[PDB]
Amino acid sequence: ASPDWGYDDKNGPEQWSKLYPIANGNNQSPVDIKTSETKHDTSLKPISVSYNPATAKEIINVGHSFHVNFEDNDNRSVLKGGPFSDSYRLFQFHFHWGSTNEHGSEHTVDGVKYSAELHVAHWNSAKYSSLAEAASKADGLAVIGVLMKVGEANPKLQKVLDALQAIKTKGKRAPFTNFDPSTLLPSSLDFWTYPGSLTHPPLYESVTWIICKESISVSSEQLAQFRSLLSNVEGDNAVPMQHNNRPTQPLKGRTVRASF
Ligand SMILES: [Hg+2]
Ligand SMILES: [Hg+2]
Ligand SMILES: [Hg+2]
Ligand SMILES: [Hg+2]
Ligand SMILES: [Hg+2]
Ligand SMILES: [Zn+2]
């Protein structure tokens, strides 16, 4: 705690190791996805998501970004299949973006950086008691990643953007209800998967990543709305959340599997 990690030139991605030595681990995320080197695994099942909109509960400004939190006391909203034998409980969705509208994703494909990224995170309810315990275990979390390509406005995002007006500053929160994050996912069921980590402190190597093969659109004015939120508390001078995307890390011999 007493966290002074951010994305600035002084507390940014290239300084994290000073305080989080795992930052130089062997299973760090994100990574670049070389489609010439992926490996077709025929045991991969089709991913299946089953979310209850009644479980959406709040939206909050965390300073470096904003999170949409879900009620995780039940198995009412879960993800199964893909490479898993158990079910993962949904707890949140959030986004990553850059200071420019063309280069802001976390994962890259064939060395190409997209405009932004959606992350829909889940924890292993079949193996651990709470999110807190699982967060640091190897099979603890499962995150779905969807690359966002700048283009035509994405109507599906509207409810999330309208909501932003109530969480302008750090630590504000607001009720966010009746919403199914599966409405945000692309049609396609194909994907890439690899073992990695959290893309920001504490950087635990506890995530089994699911990268969707199809990207979704977003427009420049949509992205400018993200960039307009502030990281300061209310009453202070305005500091815009300009970017929150970490650089891709070395594979260190991990294998990216593909469902196709
Ligand atoms: Hg994608
Ligand atoms: Hg879908
Ligand atoms: Hg899918
Ligand atoms: Hg997907
Ligand atoms: Hg997918
Ligand atoms: Zn994320």
UniProtKB/Swiss-Prot annotation:
| Top EC class, one word | lyase
UniProt keyword annotations, A-Z: Acetylation, Cytoplasm, Lyase, Metal-binding, Zinc
Enumerate the Pfam families for this protein.
Carb_anhydrase
| Region of interest: Disordered | 1-30, 240-260
| Enzyme Commission number(s) of this protein | 4.2.1.1, 4.2.1.69
How is activity regulated here?
Activated by histamine, imidazole, L-adrenaline, L- and D-histidine, and L- and D-phenylalanine. Inhibited by coumarins, sulfonamide derivatives such as acetazolamide, benzenesulfonamide and derivatives (4-carboxyethylbenzene-sulfonamide, 4-carboxyethylbenzene-sulfonamide ethyl ester, 4-(acetyl-2-aminoethyl)benzene-sulfonamide, 4-aminoethylbenzene-sulfonamide), and 'prong inhibitors' BR15, BR17, BR22 and BR30. Activated by a short exposition to Foscarnet (phosphonoformate trisodium salt), but inhibited by a long one. Esterase activity weakly reduced by cyanamide.
The UniProt similarity line reads: Belongs to the alpha-carbonic anhydrase family.
Protein name listed in UniProt: Carbonic anhydrase 1
